[PDB]
Amino acid sequence: TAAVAIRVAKKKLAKPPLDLHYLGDRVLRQPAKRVSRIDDELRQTIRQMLQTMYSADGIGLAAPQVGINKQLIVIDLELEDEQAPPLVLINPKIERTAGDLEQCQEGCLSIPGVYLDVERPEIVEVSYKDENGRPQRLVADGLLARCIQHEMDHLNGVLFVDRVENRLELNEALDKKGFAVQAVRPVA
Ligand SMILES: [Zn+2]
Numbered sequence: 001t002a003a004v005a006i007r008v009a010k011k012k013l014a015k016p017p018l019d020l021h022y023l024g025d026r027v028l029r030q031p032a033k034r035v036s037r038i039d040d041e042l043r044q045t046i047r048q049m050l051q052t053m054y055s056a057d058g059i060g061l062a063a064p065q066v067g068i069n070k071q072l073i074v075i076d077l078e079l080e081d082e083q084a085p086p087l088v089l090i091n092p093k094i095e096r097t098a099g100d101l102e103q104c105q106e107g108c109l110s111i112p113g114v115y116l117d118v119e120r121p122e123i124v125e126v127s128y129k130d131e132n133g134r135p136q137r138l139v140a141d142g143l144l145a146r147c148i149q150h151e152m153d154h155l156n157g158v159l160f161v162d163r164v165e166n167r168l169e170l171n172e173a174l175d176k177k178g179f180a181v182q183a184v185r186p187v188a
Contacts, residue, residue, distance in 0.1 A: 062154030
C-alpha cells in the first residue's frame with residue numbers, strides 16, 4: 001500500500017537532492033537494471049529526480065544520469081497546463097516508432113552547454129508501469145516523442161551525441177565545454 005505522494009513543486013531549489021553525471025562518466029554507458037519494486041522508497045527517489053530535474057532546468061531525467069542504476073525516467077515538458085502531472089516511466093519498452101525522420105536540436109542535463117541536431121522518428125509508442133505500478137501505454141509525437149526516445153536511450157547507455165551526424169559541429173561543441181569526442185559511441 002503506497003504512502004508517499006508525488007506532489008513536487010516545479011521550482012528550482014537552493015540545494016537539489018541528487019547530483020548529475022556528465023559525458024565521459026561510465027555511469028552514463030551502463031544499461032539500466034530493471035526495477036523490481038515500485039514502492040514508497042522508489043517514489044521518494046522519483047520525487048528527488050523531479051526536484052533535481054526542475055533545479056537543472058530540464059524536461060526529462062533518466063536515473064543513470066544521477067548515478068541510479070534503474071530503468072526509471074521522469075519527464076515534465078508541458079508548457080500550457082503549468083501544473084499537469086509529470087510522466088513517470090518505470091521499466092519502459094518502445095513498442096514501435098512511426099512517422100518520418102525529423103531533425104531537431106537537442107540538449108541534455110548530462111552534457112551541459114552542448115546543443116546539436118539529432119534525427120529521430122517523429123512518433124513513438126511506449127509501454128511502461130507508472131509511479132503506482134499500474135501498466136500503461138502511450139503514443140507520442142513532437143517534443144514528447146523526442147524526449148521519450150532521448151530518455152530511453154539513457155537506459156541503454158546511449159547519449160544524444162552518439163546520433164549527431166555533423167562532425168564539425170560535434171567536435172566544436174564538445175571541445176568548448178571540456179568534453180571529449182572520444183567519449184562519443186557509435187549507434188548500434
Ligand atoms: Zn539526456
